[PDB]
């Protein structure tokens, strides 16, 4: 019960059970992994009063793969995390092409979960006295 500032919440593809009248929830590291799935699945203007939430990775569809592109991809990913996921620090972004013919680009993101609580983390019994900005 030491790791209570990562928090608890709804699972992303919310599932409803009938063996008990409840919706499944996630916590800790599991919760972090689903947060990342949400962020990179939504476009910048799709939320109603949150006009700047999501990412622009679609800009790179139907384009050739080179050094300039790879630099741009890395920048897009890092900024989305700095703005929207306070609980982690990116470690490495590995961008490679696994198919000579099929139009595939493979991106592997590795990251580290923070041991100390961020000033941007809105978890209920903490942000009240620790959420300065």
């Amino acid at each position: 019960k030491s790791k209570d500032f990562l928090g608890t919440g709804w699972g992303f593809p919310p599932e409803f059970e009938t063996s008990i009248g409840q919706v499944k929830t996630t916590s800790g590291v599991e919760d972090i992994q689903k947060s990342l799935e949400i962020l990179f699945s939504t476009k910048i203007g799709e939320r109603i009063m949150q006009p700047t939430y999501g990412c622009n990775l679609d800009e790179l569809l139907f384009s050739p793969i080179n050094r300039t592109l790879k630099t741009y991809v890395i920048e897009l990913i890092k900024n989305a995390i700095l703005y929207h996921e306070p609980r982690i620090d990116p470690e490495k972004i590995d961008i490679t092409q696994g198919n000579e013919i099929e139009g595939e680009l493979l991106i592997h993101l590795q990251y580290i979960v923070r041991a100390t609580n961020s000033r941007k983390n809105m978890v209920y019994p903490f942000y009240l006295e620790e959420g300065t900005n």
């Binding site: 209920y124 019994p125 903490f126 006295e129």
Partner: peptide, 8 residues
Amino acid sequence: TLNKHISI
């Protein structure tokens, strides 16, 4: 009966 913030 809510949880409070804890400090030292």
